[PDB]
Design a protein around this nucleic acid. Sequence first.
DNA 1: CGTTTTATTTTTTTTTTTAAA
Lengths: 159, 606, 166
Amino acid sequence: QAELPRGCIPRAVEIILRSELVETVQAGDRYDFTGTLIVVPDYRMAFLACSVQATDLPMSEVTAEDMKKQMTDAEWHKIYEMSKDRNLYQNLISSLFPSIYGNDEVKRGILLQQFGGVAKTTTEKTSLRGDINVCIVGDPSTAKSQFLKQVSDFSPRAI
Amino acid sequence: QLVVWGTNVVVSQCKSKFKSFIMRFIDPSAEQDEISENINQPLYLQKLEEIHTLEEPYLNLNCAHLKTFDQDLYRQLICYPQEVIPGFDMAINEMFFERYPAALLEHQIQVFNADKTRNMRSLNPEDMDQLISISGMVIRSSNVIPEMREAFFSCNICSFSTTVEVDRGRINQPTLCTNCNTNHCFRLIHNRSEFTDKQLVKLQESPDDMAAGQTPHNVLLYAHNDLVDKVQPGDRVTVTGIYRATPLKTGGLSSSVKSVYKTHVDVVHFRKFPPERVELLQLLAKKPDIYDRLARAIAPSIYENDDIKKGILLQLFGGTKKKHATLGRQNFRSEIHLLLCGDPGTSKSQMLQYVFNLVPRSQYTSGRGSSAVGLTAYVTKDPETRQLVLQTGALVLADNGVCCIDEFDKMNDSTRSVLHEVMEQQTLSIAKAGIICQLNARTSILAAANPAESQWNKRKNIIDNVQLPHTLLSRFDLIFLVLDPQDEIFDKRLASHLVSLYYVTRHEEEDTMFDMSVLRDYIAYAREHLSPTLSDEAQQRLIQAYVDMRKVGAGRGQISAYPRQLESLIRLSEAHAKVRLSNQVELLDVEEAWRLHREALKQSAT
Amino acid sequence: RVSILAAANPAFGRYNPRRTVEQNIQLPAALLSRFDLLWLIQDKPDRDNDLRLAKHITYVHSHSKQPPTRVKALDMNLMRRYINLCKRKNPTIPDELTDYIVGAYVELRREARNQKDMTFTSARNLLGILRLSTALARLRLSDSVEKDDVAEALRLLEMSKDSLNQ
DNA sequence: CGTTTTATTTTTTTTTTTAAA
Ligand SMILES: Nc1ncnc2c1ncn2[C@@H]1O[C@H](COP(=O)(O)OP(=O)(O)OP(=O)(O)O)[C@@H](O)[C@H]1O
Ligand SMILES: Nc1ncnc2c1ncn2[C@@H]1O[C@H](COP(=O)(O)OP(=O)(O)OP(=O)(O)O)[C@@H](O)[C@H]1O
């Protein structure tokens, strides 16, 4: 989907892989394959590859510090100013949809949807759960689908 | 006299005759026959300039110039044409040295385009190995299938790693390969060799000469290695080619063969900027008559409420985007769509037919004759193993084209509600159990909307009339009225004009000059190297007048605007700037909106 | 490319005079506009009417060929062949009609509007009254669309109407 | 101068279509 043409469709092509490459693939990811196109000795075409390149070592706003793991959350030193100063919430109300305006309740509420829920330590007799059922309505001509579309850029599995 | 046993053709005659013809060549159209035309050198030498200097290989060239020269060349080229055509390429590959001897003479050319056809319906034994060219509309978009040409061998002892290409199908076997001492037996493997590409898509003939109550009969052929996805599929196109035939494997128990031969056509070619005349380009922009002059051209004969030719003003000097190179967000596409509403049998197809008869992206549609779901490429049964593919949708193959739609409040709820998003989003989420994606396509829309009634019932503001609410009935900028002037006054005019269109037996070239093609090129220049901006001038108007836009909203049975049509206004801003010569925004353009809008928007009396 | 033949029956009743056109009928205007001519056929009790029609019918019941001694009958072959000689005239409609006919059309459009509970009109009304006349010159076989060519056009149009009240 | 050839049926899901007071 980084490559997308007019008219034409992401047509389908078929491939095999080795033991260490095997069953190490999940939903919609961006990997680097190998261009070893090969024939069918039926003919028709096929192809083949041998190499892929699809959070202990840290994400963006860092450089290496210490944590529970190597750099899983190491950069407390810079996070923590933006962790506790509870007006930071207003950044999370303001500094996240600056190109957009609506109600200010959604823009202060969605975040915990994105973020983990409960995940407690209790029964086998019954499950307890974290996430929640959710909605949004109104009527159109009110900018009520910009946000959903943006999530696909914002967050993972924002399908 | 050196010839195939069963023929009458020779390389040297056609070669020399054509080399003399291209030496009998200054553009024989534009320098011998059409001496009133003029580009004065043999064009192919000129091209060997304008190909080599262009460094832009794989020429395209016809041979209908050859009617003046000796026609025996024409005939023996018509009839024996896979055995003379390379000879004419050899003459060209000789012509290389006429103009550049010591070039990088390592590339070849591609290539006819002269002979006739009438139709595909009925051909004959005579017409077996002959030149043909026919046309229609394309159906499919195929994949590729390559084809082999050579064997790369192996060995057992001392590396007798031989090789050899194919005539078309055999390799020989003495006890070793190219029998080299036979240290081992014969060897072969089939990959490190020469392969060749092709596809297959068929055509639907679609002329005005289609015989009475007759079905589609349709034809098809492969490609060659450069003639492979030249093709945004599905439009009005011609081909050249050579009628081909093939026997067929009877049954399938064993090598029995059929009596009947299948046929298709050989695979050759298909059919579809000037600094000279810069003068009139600027001349027409600075002429304030753009409002009507070209609009006066479009309907050739019809004034039919020529405030609709000023509605044709809406439409061309091509349509600029405010794409979002700065921030990258939001994908704000500058789409355009309007309808032509009903309650009188007006020209709400005829214009749409004029268009489709002119624009190649040509389709006509309406309710209850087809499905809402014709984006499916149905797998009713396939030539596959139920690898269920939905190859290509139909209604969406109009890439920036048009499908004409008629009689719009005709279908069920699912139809025509299903499209509540594509209009200004051009996405089609294929979220079914089969293969999945988020595709792209965007184009133009026009139809002949109709309420529940034949005539607009009087006494009754328009929001009541169509059965859509004051969100969806009042949706667009304006969805434009089409009334009868309630009197004889307008009625007799176009009668008096075009009663005699049979009986006029002529056409008048007036000061509203019927532009044969001098119109059709300027628009193609209309988008190239000036780029409409929007600064600080022409936007405060409905920034401020949104007061006037929306404060008529206090009211039920009246209607105000909603915030997608302001988008339609900023999209209106794009066109008029370059032409009339300020690519930065001028302010008058919004009046055109009020010239358009309140023509049926402040017609909100009650 | 098919010429179209529409034939139907009135609604509940047989043209109940109280239930008016599209009061007694239930058909959208969109199809009537596509139709050149709409024709209601009712013949109320006429003491003398059905007589002739009866004896006429019974003639081919006592006999096999109805019409004696008023015309030379034309077989399917002869009929078709004579018709075969007709359509390729492409006749002449001289220029005075163009100004004249556009005037006569207006005569309709006024007596259409002078009653307000009346039929709507499409451009095909004028296109039709144009369309019919030049055809009939094919069977006149003289390339001479003239006054009678359209006076019969309007005549038959008028007979299409003004038949249900009186 | 000898010794051998050849068959498939029911169920899915889509897109079509069709039913009652
Ligand atoms: N507070 C706001 N912030 C940003 N944009 C706004 C705001 N209010 C209105 N708009 C604009 O109004 C327009 C409303 O039309 P829009 O394209 O959103 O339809 P839509 O909401 O996508 O319809 P649907 O959600 O039903 O698909 C939006 O494009 C949006 O840019
Ligand atoms: N001023 C005019 N000039 C030329 N043609 C006209 C004019 N007014 C009406 N017509 C004709 O009237 C016809 C209207 O019918 P058409 O077949 O387009 O109907 P339609 O728009 O599909 O009808 P509806 O939308 O009500 O179903 C056109 O073919 C057109 O030729």
